């Protein structure tokens, strides 16, 4: 399962 | 921009034998960026239905992908890879060697 | 015994030919399970092995929706990376993600891995401590600071050390006849003239798996590390690699130089001779 937060660079 | 330029290797799924099925591959590795044109060729001529993997890469960040597609490989039919990359000046031929 | 999961995610601007792809793909060792395409006709999470099949519809929704999440949020970020470099707006420019986490043999947490590159270098990695970041330059220097301010660090331990070691477990048990089936390597030496006074010994591995392989050659009980041909591993396209080692020797030495293959497989590393 991937990881489930997606932060902007 | 650092590019690389593709590796390239053309080989059968299993050792070869005349009139027997069998699959042909081309694995294009170490090259960046991503976009890449990969054909597998008989006697010259573009083969069709070729299938490819998913883009993935290695620990040093190169792609790698496999393209292949089934054949039956006979004494005289030649086969061979055709690949170009943004690092080429022109298509890469690699032709398909039974002891490679 | 060893296994390790990782996500490997591709981000692609092309400017003047819409909007950048986005590529998520998963694997279990040597084995990839699923992909995601922002450029497929219908963009969802697609099974790539067998064993992953039985998982439920609310396991692929879930996984969907954090791929769309990534693909709007990688987006950002090639333009936020496009600046931090004063980049023109007209070359394309990708960003690669790789994380996951490494198991021992008794499947205990042995490291977690998160690191990202900026057209193929390395721009910003997270210490083996996963509480810190490594970043490569000024730039990378910016998105660190944005990552310490949402606690990214802190939420990646609690994934690796969490969530990724347990569906790691789930997944190899689930696809135990495979993954945790080691395929030796099938062998033999090949004999070729170059010319009237030299020849080529080939050595060949394959149907193996997992990948990792060691393949020698020998003269007289030494290494010829800088004699030897030596080809990348290969996919053979049914789950299992191939490889092959070569070296020229002078006709008739060939008894003196030994092929040596060491494999997971194995029962006992095998040592071959060119059998005329």
Same mark, same amino acid.
């Given at each position: 399962?991937?990881?489930?937060? /997606?932060?902007?660079? | ?60 960040? *190169? ?14 039919? &030649?086969?061979? #890879? ?19 | 015994? *060893? ?10 601007? $092309? ?22 395409? /922002?450029?497929?006709?219908?963009? $969802? ?30 987006? =950002? ?37 998160? %690191? ?8 910003? !990695?997270?210490? =083996? +401590?996963?509480? /810190?970041?490594? !970043?490569?330059?000024? !730039? ?16 990646? $331990?609690?994934?690796? @050390? ?14 135990? &006849?495979?993954? %945790? ?30 990948? @990792? ?5 020998? $003269? +007289? ?23 092959? !080692? ?12 030994? #092929?040596?293959?060491?494999? &997971? ?12």
């Amino acid at each position: 399962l991937p990881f489930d937060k /997606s932060t902007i660079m | 921009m650092i590019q690389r330029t593709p590796k390239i290797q053309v080989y059968s799924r299993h050792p070869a034998e005349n009139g027997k099925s069998n699959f042909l591959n081309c694995y294009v590795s170490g090259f960046h960026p991503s976009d890449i044109e990969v054909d597998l060729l008989k006697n010259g001529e573009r083969i069709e239905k070729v299938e490819h993997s998913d883009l993935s890469f290695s620990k040093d960040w *190169s792609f790698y992908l496999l393209y292949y597609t089934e054949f039956t490989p006979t004494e005289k039919d &030649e086969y061979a #890879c055709r690949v170009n990359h943004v690092t080429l000046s022109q298509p890469k031929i690699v032709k398909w060697d039974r002891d490679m | 015994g *060893s296994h390790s999961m990782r996500y490997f995610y591709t981000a692609m601007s $092309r400017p003047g030919r819409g909007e950048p792809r986005f590529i998520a793909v998963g694997y279990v060792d040597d084995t990839q399970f699923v992909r995601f395409d /922002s450029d497929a006709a219908s963009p $969802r999470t697609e099974p790539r092995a067998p064993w992953i099949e039985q998982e439920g519809p609310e396991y692929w929704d879930r996984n969907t929706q954090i791929f769309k999440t990534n693909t709007q949020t990688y987006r =950002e970020s090639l333009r936020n990376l496009r600046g931090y470099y004063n980049q023109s707006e007209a070359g394309s420019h990708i960003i690669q993600r790789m994380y996951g986490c490494d198991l021992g043999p008794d499947g205990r947490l042995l490291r977690g891995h998160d %690191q990202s590159a900026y057209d193929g270098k390395d721009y910003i !990695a997270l210490n =083996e +401590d996963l509480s /810190s970041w490594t !970043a490569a330059d000024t !730039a990378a220097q910016i998105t660190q600071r944005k990552w310490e301010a949402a606690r990214v660090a802190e939420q990646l $331990r609690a994934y690796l @050390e969490g969530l990724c070691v347990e569906w790691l477990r789930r997944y190899l048990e689930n696809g135990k &006849e495979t993954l %945790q089936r080691a395929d030796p390597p099938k062998t033999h030496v090949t004999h070729h003239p170059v010319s009237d006074h030299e020849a080529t010994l080939r050595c060949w591995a394959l149907g193996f798996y997992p990948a @990792e392989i060691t393949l020698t050659w020998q $003269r +007289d009980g030494e290494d010829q590390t800088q004699d030897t041909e030596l080809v990348e591993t290969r996919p053979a396209g049914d789950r299992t690699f191939q490889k092959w !080692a070569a070296v020229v020797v002078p006709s008739g030495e060939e008894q003196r130089y030994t #092929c040596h293959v060491q494999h &997971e497989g194995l029962p006992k590393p095998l040592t071959l001779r060119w059998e005329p």
